[PDB]
Design an enzyme around this catalytic site. Structure first.
Site, PDB file in Angstrom:
ATOM      1  N   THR A 281       0.817  -1.211   0.000  1.00  0.00           N
ATOM      2  CA  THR A 281       0.000   0.000   0.000  1.00  0.00           C
ATOM      3  C   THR A 281       0.865   1.281   0.000  1.00  0.00           C
ATOM      4  O   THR A 281       1.994   1.268   0.467  1.00  0.00           O
ATOM      5  CB  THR A 281      -0.899  -0.090   1.220  1.00  0.00           C
ATOM      6  OG1 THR A 281      -1.484  -1.395   1.199  1.00  0.00           O
ATOM      7  CG2 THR A 281      -1.996   0.946   1.243  1.00  0.00           C
TER       8      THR A 281
ATOM      9  N   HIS B  14      -3.006  -4.260   8.243  1.00  0.00           N
ATOM     10  CA  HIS B  14      -4.096  -5.244   8.062  1.00  0.00           C
ATOM     11  C   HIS B  14      -5.486  -4.646   7.732  1.00  0.00           C
ATOM     12  O   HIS B  14      -6.151  -4.057   8.574  1.00  0.00           O
ATOM     13  CB  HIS B  14      -4.199  -6.154   9.272  1.00  0.00           C
ATOM     14  CG  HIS B  14      -5.094  -7.328   9.046  1.00  0.00           C
ATOM     15  ND1 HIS B  14      -6.180  -7.609   9.847  1.00  0.00           N
ATOM     16  CD2 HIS B  14      -5.084  -8.271   8.077  1.00  0.00           C
ATOM     17  CE1 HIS B  14      -6.786  -8.690   9.394  1.00  0.00           C
ATOM     18  NE2 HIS B  14      -6.144  -9.107   8.316  1.00  0.00           N
TER      19      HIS B  14
HETATM   20  N1  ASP Z   1      -4.396  -1.856   3.690  1.00  0.00           N
HETATM   21  C1  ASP Z   1      -4.154  -2.758   2.527  1.00  0.00           C
HETATM   22  C2  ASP Z   1      -2.970  -3.669   2.833  1.00  0.00           C
HETATM   23  C3  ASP Z   1      -1.739  -2.894   3.205  1.00  0.00           C
HETATM   24  O1  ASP Z   1      -1.883  -1.669   3.479  1.00  0.00           O
HETATM   25  O2  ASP Z   1      -0.624  -3.479   3.186  1.00  0.00           O
HETATM   26  C4  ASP Z   1      -5.369  -3.617   2.158  1.00  0.00           C
HETATM   27  O3  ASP Z   1      -5.728  -4.520   2.917  1.00  0.00           O
HETATM   28  O4  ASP Z   1      -6.021  -3.431   1.098  1.00  0.00           O
END
Ligand code: ASP
Ligand code: ASP
Ligand code: NA
Ligand code: NA
Lengths: 298, 298
Positions: free
Chosen positions: B157, B210
């Protein structure tokens, strides 16, 4: 060992028609009756809200499931979300086609996948995996909604919240969206913290109204922010949340709120919001602010 | 005139290599300088987060845009969201395929539609309406991500906040999701209050970690709740939000925060999270606790 409560809402609106109006009253009453019967019988908060919202889905007077408004395609795309106050479990589906009960699919997203939100064709594929049939989309279309979509082109939500006997809380929201939405438009209803929220340490909210606004203020988490700050009533917290949406964004709507302790309210800023609750053997119900009834339970 | 600020994050994981670690650091530093050069020129908070998030999408070292992780079907499905602290304008896309820059789609959702959130084929039809062209999906796929997908299917992300010269705040978050997610799985990234929040009366946040946990606690909105309460620095507000997510859910993650006054922090409970900030004449950058470097802006 607490005193059960269930509250339902049938969606912020403006003026409700004539024949339509006794029947809407009848619908919320019957959905909240049912969800309460789930609780009296010893079922969970989550069970009760799914049941209530599922009946209001099957009911064609309400904009969820059968009865859902139409997209700019004249098509039904539905969103819905469910949450568990105990452990913060959640489930939600967006832009689902040809599924009679999204709230059920959403609860399946909660219990049966390591995720909380599925959309579109992925939530469709999941419905199949779960052994849920698709229905012809025409089945969800009522003739009143075709005329709504005809008008909206020519010129110019249901939820419940519950406290169960063990004190757990939960909410459920389910919608057809707003009439003439672009395709794959997602409102607040599938969005945790906006279309509702549930946490055993505070309470549970389900919201209705202009979805974009609800999204932007995280309306359901916001009623509860106000309620977790010590010396406010559910009724106050509801109004501060809804006040902030109206005044900050010109955004109208409503919510239903039940606290950790059993307190409940149904507030709205729009012209009306059909609601009903059940607690301690009475059933409460209204549409406008001035038709509140009370009556001994059946 | 406020002194403009810009923070970016590259997402948090279990570990990062050493050949691609110097190259990860370079990546967040460049997106940060890019975004901050937009603010120096009189561009808006929103311009600068689009520009930095879009650079990170194009940088293949990061799980967003080109370099997005793979779903269960070995496919790329992307989420993104953007927000205007000034009027709470927001735009979002979920489950987006074959588009080069999901953040720029999301911004065209904000400015060009009456809606905030579009998903799947609806997002795609909106992109064709805007002049944007699908790319073949193989070119967002890296070999690194083909092997993660397999490592996970055998055994077992990016974002930005800005405060511009006139004092508007904003965020942008973009992701490819989590490896081996279900088709149509929607995370926190396109969800207001979870993947980020921006409000001129408080500050702006972008999260990572998460996804399911992030949504259940409304992590961005929460960071900001603590900060608006008083008695707290941006450092403390983000420790508490993240500390709660981990204590209540065992969910680990990070955030980047910038308050309405120009103070920022980068904060994670994962092992590492790449980040860089630019403010004034200096560039801050890091991955782990002991590797923060501060260097003169180029
Ligand atoms: N927040 C992201 C994962 C991450 O940020 O690594 C998602 O679950 O879509
Ligand atoms: N909240 C719903 C509409 C409503 O509440 O009536 C939506 O925008 O999707
Ligand atoms: Na219905
Ligand atoms: Na990338």
């Amino acid at each position: 060992h607490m005193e059960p409560v269930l509250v339902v809402h049938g969606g912020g609106a403006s003026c409700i028609s004539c024949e339509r109006r006794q029947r809407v009253r009848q619908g919320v009453i019957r959905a909240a009756s049912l969800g309460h019967g789930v609780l009296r019988a010893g079922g969970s908060a989550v069970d009760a809200v799914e049941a209530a919202v599922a009946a209001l889905e099957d009911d064609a007077e309400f904009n969820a499931g059968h009865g859902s408004v139409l997209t700019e395609n004249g098509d039904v795309e539905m969103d819905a979300s469910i949450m568990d106050g105990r452990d913060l479990g959640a489930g939600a589906v967006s832009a689902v086609r040809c599924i009679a009960n999204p709230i059920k699919l959403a609860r399946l997203v909660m219990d049966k996948t390591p995720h909380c939100f599925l959309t579109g064709q992925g939530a469709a594929k999941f419905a199949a995996d779960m052994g849920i049939s698709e229905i012809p989309g025409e089945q969800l279309v009522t003739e009143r909604n075709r005329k709504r979509l005809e008008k909206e082109r020519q010129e110019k939500t249901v939820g419940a919240v519950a406290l169960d006997c063990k004190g757990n809380v939960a909410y459920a929201t389910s919608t057809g969206g707003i009439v003439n939405k672009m395709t794959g438009r997602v409102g607040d209803s599938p969005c945790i913290g906006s279309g509702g929220y549930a946490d055993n340490s505070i309470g549970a909210v389900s919201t209705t109204g202009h979805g974009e606004s609800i999204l932007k203020v995280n309306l359901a988490r916001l009623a509860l922010f106000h309620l977790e700050q010590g010396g406010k009533t559910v009724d106050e917290a509801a109004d501060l949340a809804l006040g902030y949406m109206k005044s900050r964004l010109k955004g109208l709507g409503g919510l239903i709120l039940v606290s950790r302790t059993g307190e409940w309210v149904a507030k709205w800023t729009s012209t009306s919001m059909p609601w009903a609750a059940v607690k301690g053997g009475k059933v409460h119900a209204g549409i406008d602010l001035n038709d509140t009834t009370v009556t001994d339970l059946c």
